[PDB]
Each structure stands twice: as structure tokens, then as C-alpha cells.
């Protein structure tokens, strides 16, 4: 488990690539340790700063029919694409948004 | 600076007479906004008393060229060329203030002194521009082209609901509405 | 400068005549103020000698649209367009300085040389403008609409107490509490 | 610039004509100075050759509204609107320089071509403005309203001692 | 500042009358763009109604001398010298918006009071300018020079398709979704 | 910005025709310099012709009001109100350049068309300004008052040594 | 701005008419460029239509005094004094664009109302300025002084190749291969 | 900007019509230069076509007032009021360009409508001004005052070598070898 992934430097996770694609990691002594039987979870709250928001700037007729879940899902997707490299997000099996 | 805050939220604001400098600024801003994000919509607020025709044409082409949808808000008045820009927004996202008017009329122009051949060429050009304006107004509206030709003979003023019935706009805003907020 | 601070505590000055640029700036500031805090009221100070009708309608619409309540203060004078802007505030929050004048009159306009058809179209347009103005005045006041029709035939100047009794001002401020 | 500095020593100049823009600037400055410290006095320096009546009214109401005392100093001249603004200060704080002139006269107005009814309305309005001006001059001075009304029929110029005898100022300052 | 961002991507706007100051600014921008990167494309956008001939020649010579390819895009109108500048871009990289107009005509000029010899010299100079104009137009077009002379006798206005068939531009770009 | 440096040290220039705007500018500058330090001295340089008399009285009051001493240096010329300002400094430190000139004359006035009574009030007022003029000229000089009356009837131009003999200045600066 | 960069690599534009302000600015930039580096070249690009004779002489004297070699490039045109500055550069480093022109003619001037003696003094100065002009032209050109005197009687326009044959420039730019 | 760099090196550059504003600017710059260093010399560049008389006297007095030697360098032209300032610099440091010219003549002035006494006072003052100007010319030159009086009656024009012969300047710059 990697808790609060967004609060680390955006380079440590460069070391997770070979973990998420090859299931292995080499220490400084040259020994290979496999990760093929582990379950990797990374928790974050990116893109959730605007849950208590009513409307956007500018005039608009009617209103957003989408619930908070859809708007927050779109915001999370945008922030995830903004924060992480495409090759890192291409290796993650599932991205789950918590309502 | 409220204008900078509006721009950061992807709102392009047009409140001056449409000329070459204003058209260049609008096109530059539209290109920059498209480059920043080719997915988020761009909002254009119209409070202009018409303007030149070439600048109108350039702005219209730039609006039709960019990838993101364009949301046009009539705000005050749209006298001669601003009405076309209001009608040139993405269908379904063209709205207007309640107490606003939209005016439409055929273009007005004048030429300097010259020989008869030059005046004939100028008249041909002006007729071509008028036909182009009628085509653009017919494409982005509901009424048939013949109705447009009959209507733009003289100054025609339409209210918000009159414009909605005409098809230039799609919605009339009344008051700020909160989101559903249903989790 | 004091202007930036007055903006910081959500106060907008309208001290010049109502034109396109001034209305545009006022409505941009209104939108920004609504965005920053959609619950705290926005204070608008009226010190303008009227202006164009289209800018009047734009400011009125953008002031009725915003969620926060609008708190309008008449300051010095409020003539024609400024009178409507002052009277368009949230009920119970439209107040004026003790000594002040509110001037109301029917719109005045000039039409260029043209054929008869254009002139009668312009006459219809100005009649529609007058009708819209009197309807807007009637909506935001307790005075009957026909009384407004006969009153706006000529210049009508009202003091703070006259405006209070007319239905345009809710109360008059005298000293800080 | 010395203007901003004297602003934080809470001194406000009125050295230009009293019009809408200067009135709004002065009103905003007064509001900000009250906001910064609602207990210390605010100094208003007057060097203006009069101005419009609406600006007079707005500045007068703004000065009368706030708690902090309006300490009014007059240099050079204070004519028409400036005289009323100087006399509108808190009692005991209205002082002027030795050889300074204060001019008082009835309002002067000009209107364009119009019908009889419009001219009658304008005349009524200007008479009301003159009556209000006399009312403020009476309530902010010691001279009875009748003599003030008789005096503003023609332009009257008063020195610092003459102003003190009239009742507009409290004391004359020459050197600290 | 949108113009600064545009210049950061090697884009130059020409939407003002072609005079000495605008020509100097355009040439300085071209030299800076060449210096920063000598082998990458430079985009020039034309929305001008025309201008003086000397500034036109200066801008044309600067564009020809600078080695990276120049892509000229017409947005609104391109009249007189603007048409020549639009046609002076790299072949295959000259574009116009779907609704645009290109105006071409022979030069017009004014001279002051003077003796007959000075007037004759000025007439020779203006005829030389016109001949240079047909030479420049024919060099960058697919139209015979005699037809060029016949066409530019009076005001000739061409749409996007008319300009494309006439050889001034190379493509009419409709939208972005439809490549 | 040499002006900023000179204002930083102690220096204030008066090299523009005297009017309300320049008057208020010098007011702000003098008040700021007094606020920054009330124990030093202020140097005022005059290279301007005359101007409005109300501004002259106002700035005379301002110099006579603040506690710091005011030094006057005259270069180029000092005409009309400028001469009075030069002579209005603290005694002992009023100086001029060798080629400087001092011009003095009776005040010039120009009023608009009006009724007889308004013109009469204006004439009395301008006589009052004239009387203030010789009073100011005499109280700061060693010349008899009636001599000033008869001298200011027409244009009177004096050199540096002539001004020193008149009593308007104290020293003539040749070189430090 | 591009101008600041080109000044960083030692470039001076002359795109306005020749007068006191432009000449004074040229003085300032030339002196500063010499002070910063007296070894590298200084480039002057001219697009001027002419100007006063006093600024002509002052700028010519400044260019001659400044010991680093000065390159001159005629970009759009060079008329009257601009041609003189074009010829006043370091020999072997005077350039002109292909579609450029150079205009040369005798000076034009006017005098105010006055007595005969003052007019004679002014005419003598005018003749002296003209003589200095053809002397300065013959100094930096390969043509005989009599030919210059006869040619500058009226206006004369030369192309880049004509200017090269006349001796005004040294190289005619073609392109950057 | 090059002008700031020139000022940092203790150079005051003057190429404008002498008036009150220019005189006050020169006052401020000279006083600041003296304050920052009262020992190192100050160079003043003259490119003006003339000026007023009171400003001339003021600037002459303040330039003679300062401790540092005031070098004067003339470019292009120095006429009437500029010649006095050019010749009033410190001895041995009055410098001219090869083609610079100096114009000298008596002061020229006008007076308004007025009574005969006022015109007589003005005429006496003008005669005094001319006498002061000729005294200043004699003081700072090697020419007898009678020759100056008989010469400044009408416009006279001197080149660099003629200015050196007249004693107004000291040496003529040719080039930096």
C-alpha cells in the first residue's frame, strides 16, 4: 500500500514501472526480488478539492444535471493525467473513484 | 483584473466595435485557448454594436475552425455583425440575457469617387458580401433563406424570446441555478 | 489605492456615465465577486448621471442573475439609468444617503437622417424601450404603473424621503451604527 | 509620491475642482481611512475653487456619516462648495490660515434650450438647491439664517478673522 | 499576452497597414526567429489591407533571404502588397481561410507640385515599380505575365477557390476535425 | 532620476508657472518633508515667472506655518509672486545666483462681463490683494513701504546686487 | 522585444527620418556599443527617407570617429542623407538588398521672411552645405566629383546593382543558401 | 537604455531647445553629479539650435558654480544660446567635431501690446541682455569685445577651424586612431 501518493516527489514512482509491468525490482546489491504475487494499492485524493462547489464562473442556463460523482470522476481523471506520466498510468490495472 | 480571471476560466470577452485589431486579438486568444486545452469549451460574451465585414468573416472562420465547442452569450446588444457571431456558436449552447436585443440588417457601405467600372466592381463585391451574409445567416438558423432575404431588407430588432423563436439562440437565462448535488 | 480595497470588501463604484465599457467592467467584477464567494452580499454604490439603455439592461440582467444579494446605495445622485440601477437592488437593501436626488424621466434619443420606414422602425423601437423601462420601474416599486406613466412624462426629481415613499428606497441611512 | 505618505498620516487634499471624479476619490479615501482606524481623526485640506453641488452633497454626507472627527484645514481659498465643506467639519476642528479668502455666493446654473415646463422644473430644482445650501450654512454656523440668505444674494469674500466672526471656523492658526 | 505565446511558437501577425515601422518590426522578428532556430518553419499570418511599395519590397527580400521555410496564412483580407506577401511563401505552404478575399491591382501614388522633368522621372519610377510588381506576381504564380498585366489593370478580387486556381495560395483549410 | 535624489536630500524645485496644481504639489512636498523630520531645513529653488495670487498666499502660509526653516535660492529669474516667495524665506538664508533677476509689479487682473455690483466687489477685492502685496513685500524687506508702493506701479527689474541692496535677499552666491 | 536582442548582438536600426532625436539616439547607442566592446563590428541598417543636414554631418562625424569598423546595410530604401550614411560605412562592408533603391539629390531648404543680407547669409550657408555634400559623396565614391555635381542637380534613383556600379555599396545580397 | 549608461559615466547630454524644463533638468543632473563625486569631471554634450536667455544665464551660473571641470563637446551645430554654453566650459576642455558649426547673433525677442513706458522698460532690458551676452562672449573668448559687438550685429557662422581660431573651442577631434 502506498498512502497519499500525491504527497511524494513525482519521481519515486518512476521506480514502480518495472514493478507494475515486469513484477520485479533490483536492489543495489544486484539481487532481483519478484512482485508477481503481490497486490499494489495506491491511495490519493487528487481532484477532490472542488466537491463543495456550486457552479462555475460565467453565465449558464439551467444547470449541470450530472451528480457530484460524475464531475468528481472527470476531475480525478484530469488531475491524474496532469500529475503522472502516460507510461505510468498505462500500467495501472484499475482506477477506482470513491463517492 | 477581472478580465484576466475570466480568461483563465476560458471566457473570451468581446465588448468593442468589431474591427481589424479586435478581430486579431480575438483570433489570437481563441488559438491560445485551443492550444491550452482542445477539449474544454470556450465562452464568448457579445456586447458589440456591429463592425466591419472582413473582421466578422475572420472571427467566424476562426470560431468554426477550432476543435472545442464555442458557447455564445448575447449580452446587451448584437447590432450588425455581432448577431452572426452569436448565431455562429455551437448549436444548443447559444444563450442570451433576458432584457437583450438582437438586430439584423443588410450591410451598409460607401465608396470613394471613381470611374464607372470601379463602381461596378465595388457593387458586385458588395452584392457578393450581402449574399454571403444571407447564406451564413440561413445556415445557422431555422427560418428559410427567403425569409432572411425579406427580413434583412430593413433593420429588424428581435427580443430574447423573438430570437429564440427565430432560431438564433437556444436558451434564455433567468437566474443562477445550483447543481443537483445528489452525490 | 482605495479602489482596490473597496473591491476587496465586495464594493463596486459606478461613478461615470453608463456606457459599454463601464457596464462591461461592472459585470465582469460582479461575476468575479460571485465566483469568489457565492453567499456574501455585493455592495453597489451609485454615483452616475445616467447612460445608455443597452448598458442599463445588461447591468440589470447581470445583477438580477447573480446568486448573492445586491445592496445598493444611492450616493450623491442617481438620474435616469442610475435610478433604475438603484431601485433594482434586493428588497430591504436599497438605501440612499440623507441628502440625495433621484431623477426619473422618459428616454431621450436622436435618429440620423433616413427614409420614413427606417424612422418609423426607430420610433417603434424607442416606444418599446420606454414601455420596457416603465415596466421595470413598476416591477421594483410599490407605485402603480399608470402613476409611473404619468410621472415620467417630464423630469421627476425625488429626495431621499420622496424616493422612500415612492417605493424605490427601503430606508435612509444617517450615521454609522 | 508625497500624496500617499500624507495619506498614511491621514491627511487628504482637495486641491482640485470639486467634480464627480474627485468626489468619488475623496469619498473612497474617507471610507478607507475610517476602516484603517475608526478612532483617530481624519484631516481634510481644502484648496479648491468650488465645484458641482452633487459632489458637495456627497462629500458632506460622507463626512457626517463616520465616527472619526473631520479636521478641516483651509489654505489659499475656499469658495462656494469648499466653504460649505470647511464649515461642515466637527466643532472645534475648523481652522484656517491667516490670509486666506472664503467666498460665498448663490449657485450659478446653465441649461440648454427647452420647453416652458422643463425650464420651470429646472428653476424649482435650483431654488431647492439654494434653499438646501442655506440650510446647511445656517446649521453649521452661528450667523442666523436670515442674514446668510441676505448675504448670498451677491458674492461675499471673508478673511480668516471675518470667517471667525461669521462663525464658519473656530480659530486662526499662524505658526506652530 | 496571446501575442507573446504566438511568437514563442514562431508565428508573426501582420494585421496593420504596411508601412516603415511595421516592416521594420516584421524584419526584426524574422531575424530573431532565424537566429533562435535556423532550420524550423516560421508562420506568417496576413490580415492587412496593403501599404507602401518600399516596405513591401523590404519584407519580401527579408523573407527570401531567411532560409527556413515561411508558411503564409490568410485570415481576413489580403489586398495589394498583402497579396504579394501571401504569394511569397514557400510553395505548398500557402493557405487561406474558407471565407477570405484576395485583392490585386496596379499601384496608386501621389506626387507634389513640381517641374516637368521631375514629373517625368517620377513617372519612370512608378512604371518601374509596376513592372517589378508584375515580375513579382508572375514569379510566384502559375499564370502568364500577359494575363497578370491584363488582370491587375483594375481591381481584381478572388475568393479562396479563385485564388487557389489562380496560384496565389495552395490550400483552403475548412476545419480541424475534418483534416 | 535626479529629481528623486534632490527631493531625498532636502531639495524642492519651483520651476513652473505658479498655478493651483503646482501649488498643491508643493503643499504635499513641504508637508511630507516636515513629517519626515521637523528639525531639519528645507531648500526651495525658484526659476519660474509669476502666477495666481491665491496660490502665492497659500504657499506663503504653508512656509510660515511649518516649524522647519525654509531656504530660498533664486536662479534664472523670479518674477511677481516668485519674488515674494524668494523674499518670504527665513531671514539670513535667502540667496540668488549672480546673473539672476528679480521682477516685481502690481498684480494684473482680468474678470468676465458682469453687472456693476459684481465688478465693484471685484475691484475692492483686487485692491485688497494689491495691499497684501505691498504688505508682504515690506515686512520681509528693508525698503520703506511707500517706496514699494511707488516702485510697483510699473515693472521693476533688479539684478542680484540690486536685490541685495533692496533687502529681498541676504547673500549672493559666487562659488563655494 | 527583437530590438533589444539585436542591440545585444550590435545592431542599430535607422527606420525614421533623420532629425535631432534620431541622431542623438544614434550617438548614444554608438558610444555605448564602442564602450562595451571596441573590437567587434557595429551594424547599422537604414530604412530612412532622408532628413536634416546637421544630423547628417553629426552622425557622419561620429561614425568616422568610432574606430571599430561599421557595416551599413540598405534594406528598404536610402534617400538623400540615408544614401550618405550608406556610403559612409567601412569600405568593403556596404550592402544592399536585391529589391532596394538609393535616391540622391541636392539639398532642399527654405528661409523665412527677412532682409536681403540675412537671405544672402542663408544662401551662402546653403551653398556651403551643398559643396560639403558633394565633397563627402566623392570622398566615399569612385566617381569623379564633376559627375556627382552634374548628377545631383535633380533626383536620381538607382537599383542595388546600379548603386554597386556607382560605388555606393560593395556587395548585393542574394539569399542564404 | 544608452542614456542611463552615459549618465552613469558622468555625462550630461543636451540636444534640445533650451527652455525652463531643460534648465531645471540640467540643474538637477549637475547637482546630483556634484553630490555623488565633487572631484571627477563632468562632460556636457551640446546639440541644440538655440534657446532662451534667462535659462542660459541660469545654466551658465550653475555650471560655473560646480567644482568639477565642465568639458563641453559640440556635435552637429551650436547656435546662438548654445555657443555661449559651448564657450563657457572649463578652459582647455572645449571640443568640437570636424563638421560641427557654430552660429552667433544678437538676441531676438518680441513684446506684447502695451504702453510706451512698458515698451521702454522692455527695450532697456533687451539692451542690457545684449550687453550681458557680449560681456559673456568676451570673458570666455580670446576676441576683443569691440569685435564681438561689431560681429553679433548679424548672423555669423563658423566651422570647426574657425571656432578654434575664434577661441570658443580648444581643439578639433578628427578620429580615434
H12: contact with F, CB 8 A cutoff: no
Taking an 8 Å cut-off on Cβ atoms, the answer to whether A59 and C35 are in contact is no
Task: Please tell me which residue of chain C has the smallest CA distance to D115.
Answer: C154
Facing residue for A55 by CB, picked from B171, B179, B183: B179
Which cell numbers hold the place of D47? 484648496
- How far apart CA G84 and CA H99 sit, in angstroms, is 14
D99 CB near a chain C CB, below 8 Å?
no
C-alpha cell of residue H53: 536667455
- Out of D54, D118, D132, the one facing C76 most closely (by C-beta) is D54
DSSP characters over C114-161: --HHHHHHHHHHHHHHHHHHHHHHHHTSSS-HHHHHHHTTS-EEE-HH
Chain G nearest CA to E32, separation (Å): 6
> What is d(CA D146, CA D130) in angstroms, rounded to the nearest whole number?
13
Measure the CA–CA gap between B146 and B140, rounded to whole angstroms. Answer: 14
Please tell me the distance from the alpha carbon of residue E43 to that of residue E50, in angstroms, as a whole number: 19
Distance CA C53, CA C60 (A): 10
Q: Cα separations (Å) of B90 from B22, B71, B76?
A: 21, 6, 20
Q: How many beta-carbon pairs below 8 A join chains B and C?
A: 67
Write out the H or E segment, with its range, that includes residue E46. strand E42-46
CB atoms within 10 A of CB C68: 17
Q: Residue ranges of the alpha helices (H) in chain B? A: 2-8, 20-36, 53-65, 82-87, 116-139, 145-151, 160-166
Q: Does D5 touch chain F (CB under 8 A)?
A: yes
Alpha helices in H19-171 (DSSP H): 20-36, 54-65, 81-87, 116-139, 145-151, 160-166
The whole-angstrom separation of Cα B43 and Cα B73 is: 8
Buried/exposed code over H2-27 (b: 16+ C-beta within 10 A; e: otherwise): beeebbeebbbbbbbebebebbbbbb
Q: Which helix (H) or strand (E) holds H101?
A: strand H101-104
- In this structure, what C-alpha cell is assigned to residue D88? 461642515
Among the listed residues G124, G156, G123, the one whose alpha carbon sits nearest the alpha carbon of residue G141: G156
Taking alpha carbons only, the member of G79, G128, G115, G121 closest to residue G100 is G79
Distance between CA atoms of residues C24 and C54, nearest Å: 11
Chains touching chain F through at least 3 C-beta pairs below 8 angstroms are D, H
For residue A22, say whether it is annotated as part of any ligand binding site: no
Closest CA to G46 of B127, E24, B130: E24
Question: Which run of H or of E encompasses E110?
Answer: none
Q: Which ranges of E9-159 does DSSP label H, i.e. alpha helix? A: 20-36, 53-65, 81-87, 116-139, 145-151
Rg of chain H taking only CA atoms, in angstroms: 17
> Hey, what's the cell of H29?
543632473
Residue A55 with chain C: CB contacts under 8 Å: 38
- In sequence order, the β-bridge partners of residue H95 are H73, H171
What's the grid cell of residue G77?
530604401
Using the CB atoms, write b or e for C110-131: b if 16+ within 10 Å. eeeeeeeeeeebbeebbeebbe
| Long-range contacts (CB closer than 8 Å, 24 or more residues apart) made by E143-151 | E143/E167, E151/E104
G76 touches chain E (CB under 8 A): yes
F124 — contact with chain H (CB < 8 Å)? no
CA distance C33 to chain B (A): 9
Side-chain-side CA neighbours of B145 within 13 Å: the count stands at: 9
Q: How many beta carbons lie within 10 A of that of residue H140, not counting itself? A: 20
Cβ E46 vs Cβ E72: under 8 Å: yes
- Give the strands of the sheet with C94-96, arranged side by side: C11-14, C42-46, C70-74, C94-96, C171-172
Residue C48, Cβ density class (10 Å: 0-12 exposed, 13-18 middle, ≥19 buried): buried
Could you give the CA distance from residue E61 to residue E55 in angstroms, rounded to a whole number?
Answer: 10
Identify which of A98, A94, A99, A92 has the alpha carbon closest to the alpha carbon of residue A20.
A92
CA distance to partner chain B, nearest, from residue C1 (Å) = 14
Distance CA C148, CA C161 (A): 17
| Chain D CB contacts of F61 below 8 Å | 75-76, 97-100
| Interface residue of C4, C12, C49, C76 to substitute, partner D, most D CBs within 10 Å | C76
Backbone angles phi, psi at E54, to 5 degrees: -65, -45
Q: Are E59 and E86 in contact (CB under 8 A)?
A: no
List Cα–Cα distances, C76 to C46, C98, E141, F134, in angstroms: 8, 9, 68, 44
Tell me if B55 and E75 make a contact (CB, 8 A cut-off): no
Q: How far apart are CA B145 and CA F153, in angstroms?
A: 86
3-class DSSP state of E73: strand
Locus of grid cell 538637477: H28
The CA distance from D9 to the nearest CA of chain F, in Å, is 8
Grid cell for residue D90:
466637527
**What's the first-to-final CA gap in chain C, in angstroms?**
26
In the sheet with B77-78, reading across from the earlier edge strand, the strands are B77-78, B101-104, B156-158
Residues of H in contact with F151 (CB under 8 A): none
DSSP string, E123-144: HHHHHHHHHHHHHHHHHTSSS-
Distance of CA C95 to CAs B82, C27, C91, C142, C171, Å? Answer: 37, 21, 10, 15, 5
In 3D space, the residue among D172, D31, D34 whose CA is nearest the CA of residue D102 turns out to be D172
- Give the residue from chain D lying closest to F135, CA to CA: D99
Contact C54, B77 (CB under 8 A): yes
| Distance (Å, whole) CA A50 – CA A64 | 14
Asked if H100 lies within 8 A of G58 by C-beta distance, the reply is yes
> For residues H151 and H137, what is the distance between their CA atoms, to the nearest angstrom?
11
Which helix (H) or strand (E) segment holds residue H174: the answer is none
What is the C-alpha end-to-end distance of chain F, expressed in Å? 25
| Residue G31: alpha-carbon gap to chain centroid | 18
CA-based nearest residue to H48, from H69, H28, H31, H73:
H73
Chain B contact present for A2, CB below 8 A: no
- Decide if B67 touches E, using CB distance below 8 A: yes
Total residues belonging to chain G: 177
Q: In the beta sheet, which residues pair with residue F18?
A: F51
DSSP secondary structure, chain G, as one string: -HHHHHHHTTEEEE-S-BSHHHHHHHHHHHHHHHHH-SSS-EEEEE----B-HHHHHHHHHHHHHS-S-EEEEESSEEETHHHHHHHTS-TT-EEE-TT-EEEE--------S--HHHHHHHHHHHHHHHHHHHHHHHHTSSS-HHHHHHHTTS-EEEEHHHHHHHTS-SEE-----
Cα maximum dimension of chain D: 58
Sheet strands side by side (includes F77-79)? F77-79, F101-104, F156-158
CA H17 – CA H47 distance, rounded (Å): 9
**The three grid cell numbers given for residue F17, joined into one nine-digit string:** 508657472
3-state secondary structure C69-115: CEEEEECCEEECHHHHHHHCCCCCCEEECCCCEEEECCCCCCCCCCC
Residue C102 C-alpha cell reads as 433621484
Contact C98 D61 (CB under 8 A): yes
Resolution in A: 1.8
Contact (CB<8Å) E57/G99:
yes
Report the candidate in H5, H43, H75 with the shortest Cα–Cα distance to residue G23.
Answer: H75
Question: Please, are residues F101 and F159 in contact by the beta-carbon 8 Å criterion?
Answer: yes
Task: Spell out the long-range contacts of G115-122 with Cβ–Cβ below 8 A and sequence spacing 24 or more.
Answer: G117/H154, G118/H154, G118/H155, G121/H154, G121/H155, G121/H156, G121/H157, G122/H155
Count of other CB atoms within 10 angstroms of residue A54: 15
Helix, strand, or coil (residue B83):
helix
Q: Write down how long chain F is.
A: 176
* Distance between CA atoms of residues H85 and H57, nearest Å: 9
> Considering Cα of H171, then H173, then H174, then H177, what sign does the dihedral take?
positive
Whether residue G28 and residue H3 make contact (CB cut-off 8 A), yes or no, is: yes
- Contact by Cβ (8 Å): H28, H58: no
Residue D76 dihedral angles phi and psi, to the nearest 5°: 75, -70
Show the CA angle centred on residue F52, arms to residues F51 and F55, nearest 5°: 110
C-beta of residue H57 within 8 angstroms of C-beta of residue H81: no
Given an 8 Å threshold on Cβ–Cβ distance, is B75 in contact with C58?
yes
- Cell numbers found for residue D19: 467634480
Q: Give the nearest partner residue to D155 out of F23, F29, F118, using CB atoms.
A: F118
Classified as helix, coil or strand, B93 is coil
For H22, the 3-state DSSP assignment is helix
Q: Do the annotations mark residue A11 as ligand-binding?
A: no
- From chain H, pick out residues whose CB is under 8 angstroms from the CB of G122: 155
Distance CA H98, CA H117 (A): 48
Q: F70 φ, ψ to 5°?
A: -115, 125
Tell me which residue of B170, B11, B164, B6 sits closest to B91, measured CA to CA. B170
Distances (CA, A) of F111 to D156, F23, F115, F119: 16, 22, 12, 8
Query: What is the CB neighbour count within 10 angstroms for residue F82?
Result: 27
Set of chain D residues whose Cβ sits within 8 Å of the Cβ of C176: 65-67
Q: β-pairing, G70-74 with G42-46?
A: parallel
CB-based contact, B72 to chain C, within 8 Å: no
Task: Calculate how close chain G gets to E132, using CA atoms only, in Å.
Answer: 9
E3–B21 C-beta distance less than 8 A? no
Cβ(B57)–Cβ(B43) below 8 Å: no
- Going by C-beta distance under 8 Å and a sequence separation of 6 or more, which residues neighbour residue D146? none
CA distance G88 to G65: 12
B45 - beta bridge partners? B13, B73
Q: Using the beta-carbon criterion (under 8 Å), do G57 and H99 form an inter-chain contact?
A: yes
Closest listed residue to residue G149, CA positions, set G163, G129, G133: G133
Q: Is D16 on the interface with F (CB under 8 A)?
A: yes
Contacts with B182 from chain A: Cβ below 8 Å: 67-68
β-sheet bridge partners, residue G79: G103
* Binary contact (C154, D21; C-beta < 8 A): no
Q: Of G75, G176, G177, which has the smallest distance from its Cβ to E27's Cβ?
A: G75
User: How many angstroms separate the CA atoms of F104 and F88, rounded?
Assistant: 14
Task: Name the residue among G140, G147, G130 with its Cα closest to residue G169.
Answer: G140
Residue E173: how many CA atoms within 13 Å on its side-chain side? 21
Q: Are D43 and D76 in contact (CB under 8 A)?
A: no
Question: Which cell numbers in the block locate residue B12?
Answer: 473570451
Nearest CA in chain B to C115: B154
* Neighbouring residues of A33: CB distance < 8 A, sequence distance ≥ 6: A24, A25, A26, A27
CA B174 to chain centroid: 21
Helix (H) or strand (E) holding B79, with range, is: none
- Residue C58's H or E segment, with its range, is helix C53-65
Give, in degrees to the nearest 5, the angle at Cα H33 between H30 and H36.
150
Helix axes D53-65, D116-139, angle to 10 degrees: 40
Chain F contact set for H28 (CB, 8 A): 2-3, 5-6, 13
CB G143 within 8 Å of CB G158:
no
Q: What is the dihedral of CA F164, F168, F171, F175, to 10 degrees?
A: -90
The 3-state DSSP class for residue B156 equals: strand
What does chain A look like in DSSP terms, one character per residue? -B-SGGGS-TTGGGGGHHHHHT-EEE-TTS-EEE-TT----B---TT-TTTT----SS--SS---S-HHHHHHHHHHHHHHHHS-HHHHTS-S------
Chain E, nearest residue to B21 by Cα = E15
The candidate with the shortest Cα–Cα distance to G96, out of G76, G81, G69, G80, is G76
Q: Which residue of F has its CA nearest to H28?
A: F2
Check CB contact of F45 with chain H, cutoff 8 Å.
yes
Residue with the three cell numbers 456615465? C17
Closest C-alpha among G164, G10, G4 to residue G96: G164
d(CA A92, CA H29): 70
Task: Copy the grid coordinates of residue H121.
Answer: 522698460
Contact D154, F114 (CB under 8 A): no
Give CA–CA dist D5/C165, Å, rounded: 45
Q: Which three cell numbers stand for residue B106?
A: 443588410
Cα–Cα distance, A56 to C31 (Å, whole number): 10
Are E37 and E67 a contacting pair, CB within 8 Å? Answer: no
Rounded to 5 degrees, what angle do the CA atoms B63, B64, B70 make?
55
Task: Return d(Cα B132, Cα B148) in angstroms, integer.
Answer: 12
From chain F, pick out residues whose CB is under 8 angstroms from the CB of D157.
121, 125
Residue D45, sorted as left (phi over 0), alpha (psi -120 to 50) or beta, turns out to be beta
Instruction: For residue A63, give the nearest of B75, B172, B179 by CB distance.
Output: B179
Task: Give the residue from B75, B24, B19 showing the smallest Cα distance to B51.
Answer: B19
Residue D117 exposed, middle or buried by CB count within 10 Å (0-12, 13-18, 19+): exposed
Q: Is A45 annotated as ligand-binding? A: yes
Residue D55 and residue D18 in contact, taking contact as beta carbons nearer than 8 Å: yes
Amino acid at each position: 500500500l502506498f498512502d497519499a501518493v500525491e504527497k511524494a516527489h513525482p519521481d519515486i514512482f518512476n521506480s514502480l514501472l518495472q514493478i507494475l509491468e515486469d513484477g520485479r525490482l533490483t536492489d543495489s546489491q544486484g539481487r532481483v526480488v519478484d512482485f508477481k504475487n503481490t497486490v499494489i494499492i495506491m491511495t490519493t485524493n487528487l481532484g477532490t478539492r472542488d466537491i463543495s462547489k456550486g457552479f462555475n464562473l460565467g453565465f449558464a442556463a439551467q444547470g449541470d444535471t450530472k451528480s457530484n460523482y460524475e464531475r468528481m470522476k472527470n476531475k480525478v481523471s484530469d488531475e491524474l493525467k496532469q500529475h503522472f506520466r502516460p507510461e505510468f498510468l498505462n500500467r495501472v490495472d484499475d482506477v477506482v473513484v470513491f463517492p | 483584473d477581472p478580465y484576466a480571471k475570466l480568461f483563465e476560466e476560458r471566457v473570451i470577452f468581446l465588448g468593442v466595435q468589431i474591427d481589424d485589431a479586435s478581430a486579431n486579438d480575438v483570433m489570437a486568444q481563441l488559438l491560445c485557448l485551443e492550444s491550452m486545452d482542445p477539449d474544454r469549451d470556450i465562452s464568448v460574451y457579445i456586447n458589440s454594436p456591429g463592425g466591419s465585414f472582413t473582421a466578422l468573416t475572420a472571427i467566424y472562420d476562426t470560431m468554426q475552425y477550432v476543435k472545442p465547442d464555442v458557447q455564445t452569450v448575447c449580452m446587451g446588444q448584437a447590432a450588425a455583425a455581432a448577431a452572426v457571431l452569436l448565431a455562429a456558436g455551437t448549436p444548443g449552447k447559444r444563450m442570451a440575457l433576458p432584457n437583450a436585443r438582437v438586430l439584423i440588417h443588410q450591410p451598409y457601405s460607401e465608396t470613394g469617387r471613381g470611374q464607372v467600372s470601379d463602381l461596378e466592381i465595388a457593387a458586385n463585391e458588395i452584392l457578393r458580401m450581402r449574399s454571403q451574409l444571407e447564406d451564413m445567416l440561413a445556415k445557422h438558423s431555422t427560418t428559410p433563406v427567403e425569409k432572411i432575404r425579406e427580413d434583412i431588407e430593413r433593420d429588424k430588432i428581435l427580443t430574447a424570446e423573438d430570437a429564440l423563436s427565430y432560431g438564433l439562440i437556444d436558451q434564455v437565462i433567468s437566474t443562477r441555478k445550483m447543481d443537483n448535488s445528489s452525490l
